Amino acid sequence: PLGSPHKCPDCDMAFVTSGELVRHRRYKHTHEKPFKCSMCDYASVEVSKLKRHIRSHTGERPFQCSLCSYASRDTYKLKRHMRTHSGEKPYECYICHARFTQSGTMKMHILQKHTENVAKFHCPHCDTVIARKSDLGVHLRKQHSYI
DNA sequence: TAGCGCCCCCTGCTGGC
DNA sequence: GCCAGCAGGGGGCGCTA
Ligand SMILES: [Zn+2]
Ligand SMILES: [Zn+2]
Ligand SMILES: [Zn+2]
Ligand SMILES: [Zn+2]
Ligand SMILES: [Zn+2]
């Protein structure tokens, strides 16, 4: 924000409250992660990130879809899932204007369709070049009996 | 501080084409 | 094989009480 009073003494960012600067410095500069999982080595800057992480250990899925049986561990994942029902495609490739349901899909599109000289994968068993690593995985399972 | 969201990242698979 | 759809784990910030 323009007049944000709390300037970071280590980068160009500034914040409206000192609490926001404190948290930003923990994330980006000092890396103090006060909140520690008791079941693995995970630790986080914010407690809410620990709580979300714990749901991966327990399987808790608090956020139920009202149109199907899906339920998520994170409110945003449910909002992302609702795009499968609405057909919303919020992301647009600035180069060719194709639209996508997720931002990562769009980034991958730009890598595969609008980027010069991208390194490709190669099947060693049949001498086929494959663009995406996951499609090399599929090829190995489908054509070379990877179990 | 904890707590609510908003949103992006990276990963890696699926099935239509 | 190419492609966009689509979910899991996670980082970082906006904002408030
Ligand atoms: Zn900073
Ligand atoms: Zn853990
Ligand atoms: Zn649903
Ligand atoms: Zn494009
Ligand atoms: Zn092969």
Q: What is the CATH number of the domain that holds A95?
A: 3.30.160
Residue A143 lies in a domain: yes
A129 touches strand C (CB under 7 A): yes
The reply to whether A111 and A122 lie within a common domain is no
Handedness of CA A129, A130, A131, A136 (dihedral sign): negative
Residue A129 lies in a domain: yes
Q: What is the whole-number distance in angstroms between the Cα of residue A56 and the centre of ligand 2?
A: 8
Residue A5 Ramachandran class (φ > 0 left, ψ -120 to 50 alpha, else beta): alpha
- What is the nearest nucleotide to A134, using C1' and CA? B12
Separation between Cα atoms, residue A119 and residue A111, nearest integer Å: 10
| Radius of gyration, CA atoms only, chain A | 22
Task: Kindly state the tokens that stand for A11.
Answer: 């980068």
Residue A3 has φ and ψ, to the nearest 5°, of -85, 15
> What b/e sequence results for A64-87 when a residue is b if at least 16 CB atoms lie within 10 Å of its CB, and e otherwise?
eeeeeebebbeeeebebbeeeeee
C-alpha A66: how far from its chain's center? 24
The CA–CA distances, whole Å, from A40 to A26, A36, A59, A101 equal 21, 8, 15, 33
A125 CA to B8 C1', in Å? 37
Q: How many structural domains compose chain A?
A: 2
Separation between Cα atoms, residue A105 and residue A112, nearest integer Å: 10
The reply to whether A110 and A122 lie within a common domain is no
C-alpha A76: how far from its chain's center? 11
The DSSP 8-state label assigned to residue A110 in this structure reads H
DSSP string of A32-99, one letter each residue: ---EE-SSSS-EESSHHHHHHHHHHHH----EE-SSSS-EESSHHHHHHHTHHHH----EE-TTT--E
State the residue for tokens 């008791």. A38
The reply to whether A123 and A100 lie within a common domain is no
Ligand in nearest proximity to the CA of A124? 5
The reply to whether A122 and A141 lie within a common domain is yes
A49 touches strand C (CB under 7 A): yes
The reply to whether A122 and A146 lie within a common domain is yes
Task: Kindly state the tokens that stand for A64.
Answer: 């139920």
Are A91 and A106 spatial neighbours (Cβ–Cβ below 8 Å)? yes
Structural domain that includes position A100: 87-115
Q: What is the whole-number distance in angstroms between the Cα of residue A35 and the centre of ligand 2?
A: 11
A94 CA to C11 C1', in Å? 25
Residue A23 lies in a domain: no
Residue A72 lies in a domain: no
Separation between Cα atoms, residue A21 and residue A10, nearest integer Å: 11
The CA–CA distances, whole Å, from A30 to A33, A43, A49, A139 equal 9, 14, 18, 44
